[PDB]
Curated annotation (Swiss-Prot):
GO biological processes: primary miRNA processing; tRNA pseudouridine synthesis
Binding site residues for Zn(2+): C22, C25, C58, C61
Family matches, as Gene3D superfamilies: 1.10.10.2050, 3.30.70.2510, 3.30.70.3190
Enzyme class: isomerase
Region spans: RNA binding forefinger loop: 243-256
GO cellular component annotations of the record: cytoplasm; mitochondrion; nucleus
Name of the protein this chain belongs to: tRNA pseudouridine synthase Pus10
Active site feature: D283 (nucleophile)
Subcellular location, principal: nucleus
Localization terms from the record: Nucleus; Cytoplasm; Mitochondrion
InterPro entries assigned to the protein according to its UniProt record, in alphabetical order: PsdUridine_synth_cat_dom_sf, Pus10-like, Pus10-like_C, Pus10_N_euk
Enzymatic reactions: uridine(55) in tRNA = pseudouridine(55) in tRNA; uridine(54) in tRNA = pseudouridine(54) in tRNA
Entry GO MF terms: metal ion binding; primary miRNA binding; pseudouridine synthase activity; tRNA pseudouridine synthase activity; tRNA pseudouridine(55) synthase activity
Amino acid sequence: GMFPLTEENKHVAQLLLNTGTCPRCIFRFCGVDFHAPYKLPYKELLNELQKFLETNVCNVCLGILQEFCEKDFIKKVCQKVEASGFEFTSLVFSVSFPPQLSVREHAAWLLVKQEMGKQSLSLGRDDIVQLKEAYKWITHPLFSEELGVPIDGKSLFEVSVVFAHPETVEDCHFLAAICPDCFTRMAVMKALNKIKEEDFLKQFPCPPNSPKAVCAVLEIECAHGAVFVAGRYNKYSRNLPQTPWIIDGERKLESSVEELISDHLLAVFKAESFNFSSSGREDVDVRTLGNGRPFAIELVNPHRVHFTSQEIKELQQKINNSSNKIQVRDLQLVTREAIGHMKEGEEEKTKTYSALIWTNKAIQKKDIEFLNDIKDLKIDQKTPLRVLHRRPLAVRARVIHFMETQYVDEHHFRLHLKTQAGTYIKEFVHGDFGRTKPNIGSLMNVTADILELDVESVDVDWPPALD
Ligand SMILES: [Cl-]
Ligand SMILES: [Cl-]
Ligand SMILES: [Cl-]
Ligand SMILES: [Cl-]
Ligand SMILES: [Zn+2]
């Protein structure tokens, strides 16, 4: 429109043109940082370039800044994207170029650096506009007009294009025969940084030669980042594991808390898989009552992500109508924070339990009264015998904050207790053959065992309780 190149740019510009470089790559090597000159029609660019200088696959980009950065190709990428059926309000654009492109870029650099030296001018390698940078300057607005959504670097919706050039693939192999301790684009980049110039020039043409064909499009793909649903679950079964318990391809028990919640969700979110996470866990024979235990489900590659509060509520009712073994409350869409909040709860927050306790010796109401007065009891708990195969042997210090008793009969009482995170309750009752000290048996001078255990509360405020 008014040509970006100065009289100073003529020599480099002419040499590059003469040896087969396209006008847009010529701008990059002249350090044109203005976006608009790159967006002009190829024909107008070539014709303005010619006019400037007197006043066909690019050997540098192999067509990337020729046909592949123009409207017709972007339209065909977007048509592919539209057929995939994702919901999205923005996109990030990811593009990958053949790793061998860096070799050609390096050769052009050496050529331009040499010409610059003739004119006693200085050029830095960082003065060259990167291929990918210029490529996105041109294509970003084209994607945006075609798809009707903004470009957002933090978008969970990604469109990716991979280019290949089979004809020149051996260049990657040629470079490994010079510095073997170095492909990826990045490992080629690393190698070219360390290669002696004379060694580069021995192996690779300078200027790079114009090839027979442009790059092939290897892949055009799109994907949506995971979305999360969180809530709390109650568990009413004493015969249900939290996650699938599979021994040899054989199920040890049927179903799980995880599956009873999640096996409704993949059809809803049109997602390919899920990862279930929770703030802690209870054993198969343990119920979780009261407000329940926080959980989150990560839904992978969801094709549907827009849901109102009412539609999520309806989802929760669907889960709840499907089982008596579990119930879900507080179901809500959340972000990746979920994982952090639940981990903190697991590691830091108190829990509350009710245990039905048996005693060998006949007890009276008055025999368990003293437990009600014990506050912040310090216990020394060796890794339980039943979990020595999973975790290493260690002595943890744990605190029983309070205990409240309800006498039942001469050989039973109920114990309500609040404990520090990570406390093994069953071992605190029966003592684990003295591997948990203090325990209910030692404190009472009986042998005690736990008949039933219920989690009464998991004292983790996250996810917010719903009205
Ligand atoms: Cl990228
Ligand atoms: Cl827990
Ligand atoms: Cl059921
Ligand atoms: Cl336990
Ligand atoms: Zn080019």
